[PDB]
């Protein structure tokens, strides 16, 4: 389903912060990569093994989200259908988030804090990437997003 531009930052356990484009290249040979993610049951950050990583959607349509966070404005470019986790109503398509939704932001490898939508706009198409993880989610540019497998 949803996918991310290649410059979106992933927090890996063994390669440090890494763009998702570079993760896809590394995962072609190294199948042991874990990424910072989130257990929605216990509400705890967890490391999640990657099970797949690819350029899924070439020249895909995109929005750019600006998210107000504890540390200032974070931006993410993702397909309009990419789901973003909210604490108030579960996963929400990027193009359906509102300023009432409560996003989950990793402010360090072991703490989270609420994020709030600042703005959303269409941007020009790009090749997009995604990964599959054991938690069906991961942090992208410190924002908790969904990782589909179908
Ligand atoms: Na995806
Ligand atoms: Na890296
Ligand atoms: Na290998
Ligand atoms: Na909730
Ligand atoms: Na919902
Ligand atoms: Na707008």
Distance 98 CA to ligand 5 centre (A): 12
Nearest to 131 by CA among 38, 16, 4: 4
- CB count within 10 Å of CB 142 equals 24
Give this entry's resolution in angstroms. Answer: 2.0
Look up tokens 């989200």; give the residue.
65
Of all helices (H) and strands (E), which one includes residue 63? strand 44-69
Buried b (16+ CB within 10 A) or exposed e, 6-15: bebbbbbeee
Distance 23 CA to ligand 2 centre (A): 8
> How far, rounded to the nearest angstrom, does the alpha carbon of residue 49 sit from its chain's CA centroid?
15
**Alpha-carbon span 84 to 91, nearest angstrom:** 5
**Alpha-carbon span 134 to 44, nearest angstrom:** 14
Distance 92 CA to ligand 5 centre (A): 7
Q: In order of start, what are the domains of the chain with their CATH numbers?
A: 4-146 (2.170.16.10)
Of all helices (H) and strands (E), which one includes residue 85? strand 83-86
Angle made by CA atoms 31, 17, 56, in degrees to the nearest 5: 55
Residue 112 contacts residue 104 (beta carbons within 8 Å): yes
3-state SS string for 15-31: CCEEEHHHHHHHHCCCC
Residue 127 contacts residue 61 (beta carbons within 8 Å): no
């Amino acid at each position: 389903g949803g996918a991310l531009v290649g410059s979106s930052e992933i927090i890996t356990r063994n390669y440090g912060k890494t763009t998702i484009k570079e993760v896809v290249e590394i995962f072609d040979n190294d199948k042991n990569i874990q990424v910072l993610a989130f257990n929605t049951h216990t509400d705890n950050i967890e490391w999640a093994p990657i099970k797949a990583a690819q350029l899924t959607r070439p020249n895909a349509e995109l929005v750019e989200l600006e998210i107000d966070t504890l540390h200032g404005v974070k931006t993410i470019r993702c397909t309009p259908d990419h789901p973003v986790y909210t604490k108030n109503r579960g996963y929400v398509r990027a193009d359906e988030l509102t300023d009432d939704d409560e996003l989950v932001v990793a402010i360090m490898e072991a703490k989270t804090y609420i994020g709030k939508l600042k703005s959303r706009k269409i941007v020009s198409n790009e090749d997009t990437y995604d990964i599959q993880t054991s938690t069906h989610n991961f942090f992208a540019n410190d924002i908790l997003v969904h990782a589909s497998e179908i």
